[model samples]
Target chain A: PQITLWKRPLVTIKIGGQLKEALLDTGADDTVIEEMSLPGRWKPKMIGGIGGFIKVRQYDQIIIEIAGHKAIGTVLVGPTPANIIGRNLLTQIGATLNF
Target chain B: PQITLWKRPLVTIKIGGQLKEALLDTGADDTVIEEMSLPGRWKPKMIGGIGGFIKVRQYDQIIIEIAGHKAIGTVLVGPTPANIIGRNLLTQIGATLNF
Candidate 1:
């Protein structure tokens, strides 16, 4: 699949047995989703964004189906403006930026 | 150029007659650069991110040379974790996401 930059590069993802939309963010170091419930043990961590730092619950070894591709990695749960799929999961799906 | 997700997609861009590295962000709506002086009239604007929103000065019709491709658009100047070339500028360069 090829996504042009004319609009937000959002794609459907399946996490926690639910379907949701997330952005393919090339700028973010870690994947972040809006605060939600996931069945797993998580650690408290802080990460920096464009504006400032935020505290989040880091859940590891979580499986997410991004655009029908399954990827297991660390996902951060916090008060994020939008669901963002960062490099961690993007690499798993073999996503790339092309011109 | 095809940039794989294995690493951060950072590229050198020439803006305000200086060279700086910036991330090609597919998730961001607008381009954001570290605070700098540009000779132009700007408007105060607020934008949201993964964590929160921040106030920025929007400089319109600013020319930026992204990876040797020149683009003119509204660029936001503010305190940011890093320079981000967002969808606004990415569109000008015909950037796309491919798998």
Candidate 2:
């Protein structure tokens, strides 16, 4: 599935029955999302980046839909400034970074 | 020019006659590099993201070669945790976000 590289690689992702705009970030190592409540239990984890690092709740076995494609994966919910769909979902969609 | 999204989309970028590995970050708005020196003058600027914002030196008309594609544009040099190739360079590479 070839997609345009918008101002940001923003895409609509549906998770936990909630839909939101997320960056299809090849740079991010894991799926990170803004603070939100989920149904399942989670493990506390920390993620680091250029600015520094932050604590996140790692929720496992979540199903998310990206551009209508279903992808089951893990999500790290925390104080991320933006929602990021990392390789987890990209792999399910057969995403390839190319021209 | 399709590229594989590895554990991280790390690529070799040539800048200021130096070659370095940088992340092809769709999540970043501006190109950022780990502290480096160039031959030109720069303007002080501030950029922000999740963890926090930081001060940077914005250098204009810097030519960077990515995957054999020449991208002449702006680059911000400072104490970045990692080197990032933003949309600026991605555009010149005819990059497309896809599945």
Candidate 3:
């Protein structure tokens, strides 16, 4: 399926057996999700952006299904306004950008 | 040319007679650039995501060259971590995302 740049390409993704909608940001360096309970332990990390940096739990090796395209990748959980699916997950599902 | 989301899709763009590198953020609603001088009249606005919100100068009808493709669209200038090119510019160049 093709995803055109019509609006913010929001899609459903299941992470750690949890369902969430995330924005597919090709520019984002890593996937950042809203803080939630997951079935694992993670290392404390951080992600910086526009105004400031947010502390996060870096959960490695998690399976996420984006619009039925399942892929295993790192997921960052923190206080994020929107779940940002970055290049890390995009490559798993073979996402590309072009005119 | 096709751009695979193998990494942060950073591209060089010429805006307001200046060259800068910006992230092709499909998640962003509008294009946000660093505070700079541009010849135009703008309306004050705000854009919110991830963290909070930031005041912006919404400039209408600006020409931006990204990856050699020239696009005319709305551009927001303010303090930003990285210059973000959103759907406004993407649509002008007919950018799409797919596997």
Candidate 4:
């Protein structure tokens, strides 16, 4: 007879060597890394999306630690003014977001 | 006169605890993290795009190293079935995606 709702903690991250601030978004499906003072190994690739074909790249897997929780996943290498945090790290801990 | 186009290397990445493979796309404006085997700290937020209002989240800045190159950037947290690599990481290296 009772309903229970869950709320997860929000995190902030710095992207590229510049260490830019960006919000983590779990609704996304992949690990998107922005272009800003990034390393050389990051390469470009052709990506297909809703808009059809686009250019993209991939990056090495990085270790993420948050709220005493940690996991290792690949970061999508690309160019964007804003960095994002997607679902790759959410499902691991069985968590959800509230806004 | 002839034109010279630059083609960068294509990198591969693993997402979530599952270590899913995703292509890095520089055309995208945001980093899209998919859902599956993700850590706990990653959270959700509201996002708006060409469609309308969508739910998204964020994650902590993860360190990505590739080909002797390393950078730190915030991972966008969201609920996507597959992982993605966006433009965030590409612009930093002054690179472009070629099909």
Q: Identify the runs in model 2 with alpha carbons over 4 angstroms from their true place.
A: none
lDDT of each: 0.91, 0.85, 0.88, 0.44
Q: After TM-score superposition, what is the CA distance of residue B77 in candidate 3 from its true location, in Å?
A: 0.6
Clashing pairs in 2: A1-B99, A95-B99, A98-B2
Top-scoring candidate (lDDT)? 1
Model 3 pairs in collision: none
Query: Which regions of candidate 3 are displaced past 4 Å?
Result: none
DockQ-based CAPRI category assigned to the predicted complex of candidate 4:
incorrect
**Cand. 4 Cα-lDDT:** 0.44
Candidate 1 chain B: worst-modelled 10 consecutive residues by lDDT: B47-56
- Per-residue lDDT over B20-66 for candidate 1, one digit per residue giving the tens place of the 0 to 100 score: 99999998889999989988799999988856888889999999999
DockQ (C-alpha based) per candidate is 0.83, 0.70, 0.78, 0.02
lDDT of 2 by residue, A1-99 (tens): 666665788889999889999998877778999998898799999987767788999998899999888899889999999999888777777887886
TM per model?
Answer: 0.97, 0.95, 0.94, 0.36
TM-score result, candidate 3:
0.94
**Residue A80 in model 3: shift from native, Å?**
0.6
Report residue B78 deviation for candidate 1 (angstroms). Answer: 1.1
TM-score of 1: 0.97
Query: Sorted by DockQ, highest first, which candidate order results?
Result: 1, 3, 2, 4
